[PDB]
Amino acid sequence: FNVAHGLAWSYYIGYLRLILPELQARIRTYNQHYNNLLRGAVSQRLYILLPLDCGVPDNLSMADPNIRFLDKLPQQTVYSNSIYELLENGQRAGTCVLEYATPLQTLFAMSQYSQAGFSREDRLEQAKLFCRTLEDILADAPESQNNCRLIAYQEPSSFSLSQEVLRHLRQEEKEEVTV
Amino acid sequence: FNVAHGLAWSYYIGYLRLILPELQARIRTYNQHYNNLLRGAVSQRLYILLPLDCGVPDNLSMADPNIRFLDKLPQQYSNSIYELLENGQRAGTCVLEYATPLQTLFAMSQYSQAGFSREDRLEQAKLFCRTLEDILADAPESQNNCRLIAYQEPADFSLSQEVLRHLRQEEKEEVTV
Numbered sequence A: 001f002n003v004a005h006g007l008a009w010s011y012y013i014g015y016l017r018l019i020l021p022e023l024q025a026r027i028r029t030y031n032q033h034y035n036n037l038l039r040g041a042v043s044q045r046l047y048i049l050l051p052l053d054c055g056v057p058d059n060l061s062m063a064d065p066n067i068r069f070l071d072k073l074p075q076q077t078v079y080s081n082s083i084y085e086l087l088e089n090g091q092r093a094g095t096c097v098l099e100y101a102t103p104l105q106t107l108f109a110m111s112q113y114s115q116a117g118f119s120r121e122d123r124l125e126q127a128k129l130f131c132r133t134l135e136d137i138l139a140d141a142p143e144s145q146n147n148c149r150l151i152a153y154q155e156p157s158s159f160s161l162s163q164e165v166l167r168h169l170r171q172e173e174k175e176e177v178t179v
Numbered sequence B: 001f002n003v004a005h006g007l008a009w010s011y012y013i014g015y016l017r018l019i020l021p022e023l024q025a026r027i028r029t030y031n032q033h034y035n036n037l038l039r040g041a042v043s044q045r046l047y048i049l050l051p052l053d054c055g056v057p058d059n060l061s062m063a064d065p066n067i068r069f070l071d072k073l074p075q076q077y078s079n080s081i082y083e084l085l086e087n088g089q090r091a092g093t094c095v096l097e098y099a100t101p102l103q104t105l106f107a108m109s110q111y112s113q114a115g116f117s118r119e120d121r122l123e124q125a126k127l128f129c130r131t132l133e134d135i136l137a138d139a140p141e142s143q144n145n146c147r148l149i150a151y152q153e154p155a156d157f158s159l160s161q162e163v164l165r166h167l168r169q170e171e172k173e174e175v176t177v
Ligand SMILES: CCn1nc(C)cc1C(=O)Nc1nc2cc(C(N)=O)ccc2n1CCCCn1c(NC(=O)c2cc(C)nn2CC)nc2cc(C(N)=O)ccc21
Pocket: A006, A007, A008, A010, A011, A014, A015, A078, A079, A080, A081, A101, A102, A103, B006, B007, B008, B010, B011, B013, B014, B015, B077, B078, B079, B100, B101
């Protein structure tokens, strides 16, 4: 009995499969303004944060204060999407469309619902499974694996999410320019 | 690999568990107006349509012409009240809506990479029903706030009549027990 299968498939079929196609161009559009104005460009990929503690806060800033909301992204000329700037020592070091995964929140709710019989150990196993399954789905999906990137991580002590995101953005740019 | 397990748990945790508590009261209120005008009442339960074919239309009246939209419901998420008709006469009224996760099972069966056949879609649809049933069977006051209407449509069927069967059964239960 694995709720993570359905959660992954439903996140893809109901949300990613629909929103991603518009994206790769919507960001291309925005970067006209962004490049001309702030002398920086937004990464093309949609970054999906997958905290394995299934802890999705209301806003990204609360979890890490170096992730800072920048600007809402427009639609192609019913979905809101937020550009966040990543920070280092107060300086802008990257920008990206970055959002938490709703399925993970369901797993947290389940672990606080006693009639589920769903322990924290169960919750973590199912979070990992959600990650692996969504990976498999995007692997066989067209231009979608290319339009979005998954960032799974386990908090220990103190941890830096802005840094883990910047790792990925810098890797993405490395790829863009090399190949 | 049963997607229906996750789909059921997500439908309950992320949606039903949220709107049902409000709903009991919201309809309790609305009926103050309905009783005064037209001598009609709206059932307290939320009726969830589970077509086994997973065919969800964009407007219920297209699925059965005897199911006319009546009125949207106010808040304490959009829910719609429908009148069920017989020979043009109003025979019932209820908050009515489709289980949207079935849409997902439909999309999957039209998505070739998934290997999700129509046989699969039907198995997972039935399973979605059984799983959500169980969930509401352990849930507090929630089983009481809504009713599941799972039906399989025939090669050789009235939805408004299926629903009306349930509503009349509900009223029977109300006045006897
Ligand atoms: C967990 C909920 N549920 N589970 C399943 C399975 C089906 C549903 C379900 O019934 N849902 C839903 N019924 C609604 C009816 C009304 C009403 N009455 O009007 C208003 C809102 C309603 N909702 C919530 C909106 C869902 C769409 N949605 C998502 N969904 C996901 O992430 C997600 C997680 C899993 C698993 N599967 N999915 C895809 C369906 N993310 C969004 C982000 C934005 C944005 N960026 O603004 C906008 C919409 C978004």
